[PDB]
Design a protein around this ligand. Sequence first.
Ligand SMILES: CO[C@@H]1[C@@H](n2cc(-c3ccc(Cl)c(F)c3F)nn2)[C@@H](O)[C@@H](CO)O[C@@H]1Cc1cn(C2(C)COC2)nn1
Length: 138
Amino acid sequence: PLIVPYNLPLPGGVVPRMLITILGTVKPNANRIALDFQRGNDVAFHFNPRFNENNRRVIVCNTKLDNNWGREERQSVFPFESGKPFKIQVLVEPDHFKVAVNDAHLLQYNHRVKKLNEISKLGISGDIDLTSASYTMI
Ligand SMILES: CO[C@@H]1[C@@H](n2cc(-c3ccc(Cl)c(F)c3F)nn2)[C@@H](O)[C@@H](CO)O[C@@H]1Cc1cn(C2(C)COC2)nn1
């Protein structure tokens, strides 16, 4: 176990068939979680569970380019629960990131940042106890 925020290096960036697995537990009064796949200061892929946006739960995904956020992609399917252990898996494919939570498909996010081999850090933050962050090739 690790204390957030945590940065996982992705040396040489990401590549298709890379599977990133984040294990932890959602804190009991959680408000937000964020994963940030970074290319320098740019955020290629921001994955942001919000537990109380206008008294709703929503997943917001986006990209930050030149310090500006782009167009949000939102999902109301919300597989997280306060207080519960989770597993987020991010599978890099040629054209998108695919996200599964607790072994159930959640969403896909098309690559806006094209230079996968420059997406060299994953930031993990928010209202979690982080157990582990690792990757393998499938
Ligand atoms: C309030 O800032 C969030 C921003 N954010 C979250 C965190 C964050 C920080 C720490 C933790 Cl621990 C954590 F879990 C976080 F999520 N940091 N930045 C992102 O989520 C962005 C995703 O579009 O939306 C907000 C900013 C925003 C949105 N938009 C629009 C595109 C314009 O109309 C919608 N303009 N600016």
